[PDB]
Symmetry: C3
Subunit: 179 residues, 3 copies
Amino acid sequence: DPIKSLLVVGGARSGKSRFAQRMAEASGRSLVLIATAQPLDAEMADRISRHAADRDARWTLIEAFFDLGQTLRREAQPERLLVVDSVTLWLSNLLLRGDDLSPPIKDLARTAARLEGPVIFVSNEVGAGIVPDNALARAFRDAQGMCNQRLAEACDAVTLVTAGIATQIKPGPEPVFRF
Amino acid sequence: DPIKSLLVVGGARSGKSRFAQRMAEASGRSLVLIATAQPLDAEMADRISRHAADRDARWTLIEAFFDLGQTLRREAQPERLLVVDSVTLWLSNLLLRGDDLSPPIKDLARTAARLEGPVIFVSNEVGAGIVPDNALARAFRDAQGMCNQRLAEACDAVTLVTAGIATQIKPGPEPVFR
Amino acid sequence: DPIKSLLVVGGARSGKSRFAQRMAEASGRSLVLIATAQPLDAEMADRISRHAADRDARWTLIEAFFDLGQTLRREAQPERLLVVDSVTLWLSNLLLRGDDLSPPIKDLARTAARLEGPVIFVSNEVGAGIVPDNALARAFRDAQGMCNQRLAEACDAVTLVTAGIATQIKPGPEPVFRF
Ligand SMILES: C[C@H]1O[C@@H](n2cnc3c(N)ncnc32)[C@H](O)[C@@H]1O
Ligand SMILES: C[C@H]1O[C@@H](n2cnc3c(N)ncnc32)[C@H](O)[C@@H]1O
Ligand SMILES: C[C@H]1O[C@@H](n2cnc3c(N)ncnc32)[C@H](O)[C@@H]1O
């Protein structure tokens, strides 16, 4: 059972990137970071420059700020393992541009199940707080939850990362109750 | 391993409804949605109309915006499975109306332990964010946490749903340490 | 295997404290609550008065608002189980003072791995909401995230408490996928 797709979900500073990187690097495959993120403020400019300087020379980086599905179709193959650094930031680029988010979330789950070579998606959980007091935050919260539902379904494996520790929730049989 | 009561907890758009609906249809009993809110804005009006179109003729609807406990005691019988749509919206009704929340929370947990028929409670986790900046939201966060704890103790089974996927957390031996 | 150090993580009003207290009281060593919390409002005062009336006189209090690593090295002995009230409030005290958080967190991880006696850290998850409106809250989200990771590494056991129910996530075999 070599898997062809893994979804890693966790909160903010959960350890999910470090965990993703560790699976990618123990694969003995040719590694490509698919990057959805553009540092456009100082806070964000830190994280990219600083934590990139602690990736091996072994990694290759391709940017995909909008056309994530298209990039995966083209760049995926059996010698390569692709890592999508943030589904979260990709969805945010689309939301802020005014795209309707259903078709591309739907395209991404399709692409993930029909992929040439293996891929790891890293995504945030944003759904476990108080309902946001603005239409934008609320609309993102729905797209993020739906998207993580459609990836988790399409992907062979799914792991949840809490406090730097990983827990497989797929593969694995879901509970079924007897009333 | 037979049960009377299930709590399904998850975040917003976690797939907890889908999951409660699947366990409900799996039982073959007669099926009642206990709706705990009508929709008073456009966004809510829509979420409650896709839900309506995705339930076939096996499903009946009884409203209980406030007297959820009483309604569960009248309607719960062995031919029936009741699904409480959102505990979260119920607590929201009580909180805004100015009710003290401890007595009705305790009465729901007591009611859950003693029902004539089976029931699935669907509820949100709301306590994994940054401390909210207003007394109303902090009070909701305290009350939804107590309510999820008292239902979870009362209920036979508890499932946690992430990214459309359920994990049982009750029954199951809890950790112990030397 | 008898353990040195337990991390207890979960959301607001999840049963973290009650769970921590149950394990502490089942251990039959001497019980010290390492309080980190100044009730400087009505809500906060009621929270810690409902806690203190639910504890047999078997419990002794000790305040550590700022110097929590130091306080743990000085009070820990196998004759004693120590329970820190809230890692979260300790972090908050430091953030508000203007301290740089990295050193004091790494110091605390170090100390937890090398204790004279058993300790339980009780800590909040705050990473699963929408990004905060303001830098103060963002800075806190990243620090509480980093702190839970390092304390999970350093502690022998990690539990995750949802709706009053503890799941053990460490020790246990981290899932490994192969592609
Ligand atoms: C959430 C808010 O953050 C800003 N924004 C959007 N994308 C980025 C980015 N990659 N880096 C920094 N700021 C960003 C915009 O101003 C948006 O409204
Ligand atoms: C959080 C805020 O949402 C509004 N409110 C309360 N209940 C509902 C509902 N079912 N649908 C829409 N809006 C609602 C009120 O204005 C409340 O103060
Ligand atoms: C988030 C805000 O909470 C206040 N604050 C800090 N510590 C406490 C406490 N123990 N109790 C109540 N309020 C507190 C400060 O004013 C800070 O700005």
